[PDB]
């Protein structure tokens, strides 16, 4: 790209508990938990009992240091800085002799000028990290209140003091793990003349016919004289040149803004997941001085995203219309992928949005108490065509809002809303998570005096209603900001659910039904979820054989909520016979996560537009542990990954029973309407045999984004009681020369009623190294099979679904692991789980 020379201080660093002098090799970017757990100074964090056994660490202070070598050529380079991408968190670093910096804020970069420091030959760097704990003691000392960061499993809620990862003090599925280190890149820069500091591609306009782009840079120029340069911008699609413009200046010593006109004529537009291609230009600035002194380039896809919020009959909108089509929102809420964040590679990074894209997710949204992700994260997110909904990093608490913390979030706004605001997924901010319910709703007013109280209710106000709108408004003025999740709807008050957006906890802490999901409706939920024990392998990660129990001490250990497991029983309890085997009612307990769920995500696509979106509680996990996630901690899709992806499926028949009558409604997410359709549905029972006749609609439209019903029949007169214990509904959908274009199946009973028969799933497999293809077979039907492998991290082309009784079934599982010579395959069902 230009003149400059980047060395990556990536090797050869050292660590050491402070006073110990003692010094071992460590591995940067990392933690210390990881150079610990490297020289076997921890047990494995996740294993067993070990949290409580590593507790320790974050009450010891952290020091660590590397040296490099400088040539006399690279110190007369005109300017060299030193980057660090992140220091978690109260970090001096040293060079030479010299206190560059005093670091306070995780989630900030920091660009330092070092070339007068620096000498010829060897370089000393040395970073000293004072515990978070022992740095924030005295300030908590100070406050004369506990915080309410309940979340934070420490008696003291330090947490809130610190610019630090919110979970990484615990949380409600989380370890704590309180940990420091230089947790993204440190790369050391020799230049000339200037850097490009911010290079933002501003859209203008967008129609078919033009796209008007503002190119704006921020150029720090190191060198005392004034210099003629000339700024380039090229704009290209799959390495061709599209436009390119030019723009004479002379940069003088500092900051130079420099703006650009740009404009792309008949411009492809971005489309997210299900609606087309995610097209990526790319756009590279370069600045010319006679060589190219500094180039800085983005990937920019063209598209509008508007929200909308706005008062309405039903109260307030809130959705997503992009490029000028309201777009029904289907993800989920994304959390940290480690305890240990420079643990996560590329490679899982690309696995995670591989299983959003084949899930057909189109938005996931970042939730406050993790961390603004990193670069790669948001890249994927462009290229795999998911809208990104931000939290700022606050959670749960109220935060303070002191003058000095308010400068500190400023300067971690400022460098993320920059970081980030080029990104085509990027589609809002929002203050934070669930905040202002906590404020109102969550009892604080008998816990702090009035004033204490009245003091967090005008800090709230300074800081989400404020500092972080404002700050938007200045560096990402057409991007959305809502002050909190959810902004007014709480789940207790049916009279504000027509307001905003819901998260819905009436399912799971309010103990309702999943059926309720049909019935209580918000505008757009961007929570709801219900927990589950993940698959037998990620358990036996954690846990010897003697401790599969759910009440171990052990598998407790990992179940940080707290009513969890009662929860759990409850609700299966309503729907399934319990299993007596801890091995059963861990497969049982998938089933019905991913039951009850996809009953409610249907029920939000169902009652669109009055709904606009979805976003299940949670996507993934940070370690083996019990959670709301539809993917365990080592990549396995649970059943409720599998439901996800069938109830987000562009076009669905969603059979919908209620009141003894059955309802069918066909939805779509197309962006083309379907004529001349056919419904087609036929009774069959658990033998295979068809009763009574095929049931035909004939001549059904699908518009393009709409969910309407086709069928209507009351159960009574058509199937008795006995019907409805022993048959399935089979529904299909085909076009007008007979092709389908989707399917469903339905039952009619809860399946503890079910007469379901005993049976085996007979099963053939074709293994080939990376790859097993399963064809199965059962004679009845086999309900809600697990085909269960030992292979972590196996992928399937389907699990969790109903063997139909005679249907030949064909299954892929693939993983780099499988071996050309027999892959371990047990297959469970509903039936076998009970005598
Ligand atoms: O309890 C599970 C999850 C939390 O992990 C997370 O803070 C989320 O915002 C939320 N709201 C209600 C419950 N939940
Ligand atoms: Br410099
Ligand atoms: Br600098
Ligand atoms: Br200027
Ligand atoms: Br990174
Ligand atoms: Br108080
Ligand atoms: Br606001
Ligand atoms: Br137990
Ligand atoms: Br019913
Ligand atoms: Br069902
Ligand atoms: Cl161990
Ligand atoms: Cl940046
Ligand atoms: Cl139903
Ligand atoms: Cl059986």
Redesign the pocket.
């Given at each position: 790209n230009d003149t400059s020379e980047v060395m990556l201080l990536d090797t050869g660093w050292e660590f050491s508990q402070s006073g110990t002098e003692k010094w071992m090799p460590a591995t940067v970017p990392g933690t210390v938990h990881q150079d610990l757990i490297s020289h076997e100074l921890l047990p494995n964090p996740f294993y067993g009992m070990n949290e409580k056994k590593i507790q320790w660490v974050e009450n010891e202070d952290w020091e660590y240091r590397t040296s490099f070598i400088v040539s006399e050529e690279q110190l007369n380079r005109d300017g060299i800085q030193l980057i660090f991408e992140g220091l978690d968190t109260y970090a001096d670093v040293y060079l030479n002799g010299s206190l560059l910096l005093k670091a306070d804020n995780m989630f900030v970069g920091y660009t330092l000028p070092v070339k007068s420091v620096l000498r010829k030959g060897e370089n000393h760097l040395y970073i000293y990290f004072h515990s978070p704990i022992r740095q924030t003691l005295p300030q908590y000392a100070s406050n004369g209140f506990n915080y309410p960061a309940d979340?934070d499993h420490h008696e003291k809620h330090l947490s809130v003091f610190s610019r630090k990862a919110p979970y990484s003090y615990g949380?409600?599925?989380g370890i704590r793990m309180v940990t420091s280190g230089v947790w993204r890149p440190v790369t050391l820069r020799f230049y000339d003349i200037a850097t490009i500091s911010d290079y933002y591609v501003r859209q203008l306009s967008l129609t078919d016919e033009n796209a008007r782009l503002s190119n704006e840079l921020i150029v720090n120029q190191i060198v005392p004289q004034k210099i003629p340069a000339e700024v380039r911008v090229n704009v290209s699609l799959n390495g061709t040149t599209v436009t390119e413009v030019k723009q004479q200046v002379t940069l003088q010593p500092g900051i130079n803004h420099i703006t650009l006109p740009a404009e792309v004529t008949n411009p492809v537009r971005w489309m997210p997941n299900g609606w087309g291609t995610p097209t990526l230009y790319d756009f590279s600035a370069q600045i010319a001085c006679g060589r190219i002194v500094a180039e800085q380039s983005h990937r920019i896809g063209l598209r509008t995203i508007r929200v909308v919020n706005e008062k309405d009959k039903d109260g307030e909108s809130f959705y997503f219309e992009v490029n000028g089509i309201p777009m029904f929102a289907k993800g989920a809420?994304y959390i940290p992928q480690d305890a240990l964040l420079p643990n996560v590679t590329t490679e899982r990074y690309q696995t995670l949005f591989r299983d959003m894209k084949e899930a057909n997710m189109n938005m996931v949204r970042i939730?406050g108490?993790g961390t603004y992700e990193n670069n790669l994260f948001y890249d994927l997110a462009d290229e795999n065509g998911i809208l990104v909904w931000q939290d700022f990093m606050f959670?749960?608490t109220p935060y303070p809002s002191d003058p000095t913390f308010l400068k500190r979030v400023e300067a971690e706004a400022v460098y993320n809303i920059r970081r980030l605001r080029n990104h085509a997924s990027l589609a809002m901010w929002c203050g934070n998570?669930?905040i202002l319910e906590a404020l109102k709703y969550w009892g604080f007013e008998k816990k702090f005096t009035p004033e204490v109280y009245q003091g967090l209710m005008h800090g709230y106000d300074k800081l989400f209603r404020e500092l972080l709108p404002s700050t938007v408004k200045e560096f990402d003025s057409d991007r959305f900001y809502v002050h909190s999740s959810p902004y007014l709807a709480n789940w207790g008050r049916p009279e504000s659910w027509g307001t905003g957006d819901s998260?819905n906890?009436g399912v799971?802490?309010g103990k309702k039904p999943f059926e309720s999901l049909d019935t209580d409706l918000p505008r757009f939920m961007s929570?709801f979820?219900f927990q589950s024990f993940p698959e037998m392998k990620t358990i036996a990660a954690f846990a010897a054989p003697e401790d599969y129990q759910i009440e171990s001490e052990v598998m407790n250990a990992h179940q940080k909520?707290s009513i969890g497991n009662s929860l759990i029983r409850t609700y299966m309890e309503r729907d399934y016979i319990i299993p007596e085997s801890f091995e059963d009612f861990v497969y049982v307990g998938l089933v019905l996560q991913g039951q009850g769920m996809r009953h409610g995500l249907e029920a939000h696509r169902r009652n669109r537009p009055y709904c606009m979106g979805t976003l299940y509680?949670?996507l993934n996990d940070s370690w083996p542990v019990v959670s709301?996630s539809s993917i365990d901690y080592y990549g396995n899709w649970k059943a409720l990954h599998y439901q996800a992806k069938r109830a987000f499926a562009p076009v669905l028949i969603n059979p919908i029973q209620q009141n003894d009558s059955l309802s069918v409604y066909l939805i779509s997410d197309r962006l083309d309407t379907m004529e001349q359709m056919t419904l087609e549905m036929k009774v069959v029972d658990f033998d295979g045999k068809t009763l009574g006749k095929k049931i035909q609609v004939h001549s059904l439209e699908v518009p393009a984004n709409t969910s309407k019903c086709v069928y209507r029949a009351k159960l009574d007169g058509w199937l008795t009681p006995e019907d409805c214990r022993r048959s399935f509904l089979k529904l299909i959908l085909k076009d007008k020369s007979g092709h389908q274009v989707a399917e469903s199946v339905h039952f009619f009973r809860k399946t503890k009623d079910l007469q379901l028969p005993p049976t085996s799933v007979s099963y053939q497999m074709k293994q080939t190294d990376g790859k097993c293809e399963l064809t199965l077979f059962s004679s009845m039907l086999a309900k809600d099979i697990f085909i269960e492998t030992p292979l972590q991290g196996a992928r399937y082309s389907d699990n969790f679904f109903d063997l139909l009784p005679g249907e030949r079934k064909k299954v892929i599982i693939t993983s780099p692991r499988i071996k050309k010579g027999e892959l371990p395959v047990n297959i469970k069902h509903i039936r076998e789980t009970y005598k």
């Open positions: 979340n949380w409600d599925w809420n939730w108490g959670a749960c998570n669930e998260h906890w799971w802490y929570e979820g909520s509680w949670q709301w």
